[model samples]
Target: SMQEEDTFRELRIFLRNVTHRLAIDKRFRVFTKPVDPDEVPDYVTVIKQPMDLSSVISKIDLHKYLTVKDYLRDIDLICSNALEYNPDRDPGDRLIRHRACALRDTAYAIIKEELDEDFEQLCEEIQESR
Candidate 1:
């Protein structure tokens, strides 16, 4: 479940304000996944729902999971390093977090059946705006 909104606090400072300027000034490339067509290579299969838990976690040395968080933590630890080699660099941290965010956002939209009509309504709403 999403946490309570009021419990969250954030700093007004934005790192994007600087990194974006640096990209233009430094001439290093910035990139995004395709906007119109799916960009994944044909050979790659994305893991999604209908996941068989035993099969997926069979390789784990731990005999059992205490909770979903524990299971996800193990998975997260395995996956947290996945983006290390992904393209684009930060001044200190090398990975581009926004690329991962874009992928997650699009996957969520697909899960919510935006392909059927949700996004079409969004387009209409945007077009109708003054």
Candidate 2:
């Protein structure tokens, strides 16, 4: 129980730090809120699983994530959904696509910095246990 609690706490702190950084970025403004299906009629049809930074924050507050990986999936989904909906064809779409790419890169850099050592240990432990 202690270990699980520690893991949850650490993950929440890490997620909060990552989200704070993302929230302050001007390029990430579009992703801070949910995409309006009424405004973008085809968004729901194209992006099957839409995700946003606000939703991620809500989930973090609710303790919806079981692990760091779960939070990472949602972060990745936010970028992927944007990239999918806004292809690189039109200038506007290309701009959003680039923003999504940059945001994902930034998020991964934070994740690696925060978790790579622990993840490496986890990998080694799994390997040694076999």
Candidate 3:
């Protein structure tokens, strides 16, 4: 999965290079979700999942997602793995970090199980050619 043994190191450096400047720059405002712990407001909406998919998508639409529409007819995927977690920006960091961690863990288990069961599945197809 790693292109190079040092990819994580390089990626961390790039993130640091970008974030360190942004932290000092007055123009940049990192969102800190500040909700009063004691506030029992009248309109308390409870989501069973405790997170909103559209909210996450909206942020992606605003920030991280690179739309090909600007380049070549952009389209959104029917299924998105855009939940790709980053330690710095993960919304789940403060709210429902356990849920986020569980989601990631479950996915990893599924992928490992699939690969183990289908190990050399491609090799089997190549054997037909032989």
Candidate 4:
């Protein structure tokens, strides 16, 4: 019971620390808020172009990869296993999810880069795909 009480106290302390600014160096806060919804820049695109899924998926020929077959299948198995996690029970579930998601995302990114402008949204370069 003491441990549970301590956990609750710790949580409250965490929330207080997170919410309150103990030190404020600025008399007036000046920072950019998120981009305004109403303000559209000249370059802002309203239309979402159709994503060519076939072209996107075609970057890696699964059948043609017979030479590196087992490695591919093993990686796929690892990814699929990661996806089937119970986040409620496991604390590391989010990390596992991100890892698998990263692999899938990286594959898509590679394909998008190869196809150039074909999968524009997918082609974005992220520093950490991991």
lDDT of 3 by residue, 18-82 (tens): 33432343322221122223662321232122222333334333533222121111111111111
* Candidate 4, pairs of clashing residues: none
Q: How many backbone clashes does candidate 3 have?
A: 1
Alpha-carbon error at 5 in model 4, in Å?
A: 68
lDDT tens readout by residue for model 2, 12-56:
777887898998899999999998878889888888888999999
Worst 10 residues of 3 by lDDT: 71-80
Tens-place lDDT digits, model 4, residues 1-130? 4644443344334323321221121210111011233662421243122111122122122321211222234335434544553244565666656655555454344434443342222222211121
TM-score of each: 0.23, 0.83, 0.25, 0.29
Pairs with backbone N, CA or C atoms under 3 Å apart (clashes), candidate 3 = 69-74
Q: Model 3 misses residue 31 by how many Å? A: 2.4
RMSD of each: 18.6, 3.6, 16.9, 23.7
Q: What is the TM-score of candidate 4?
A: 0.29
Ranking by TM-score: 2, 4, 3, 1
Where model 1 places Cα greater than 4 Å from the true spot, the runs are 1-56, 59-62, 87-130
Q: Compute the lDDT for candidate 4.
A: 0.33
> The CA-based lDDT of model 2 is what?
0.80
- Ten-residue region with minimum lDDT total, candidate 4: 23-32
lDDT score at residue 4, model 2, on the 0-100 scale: 53
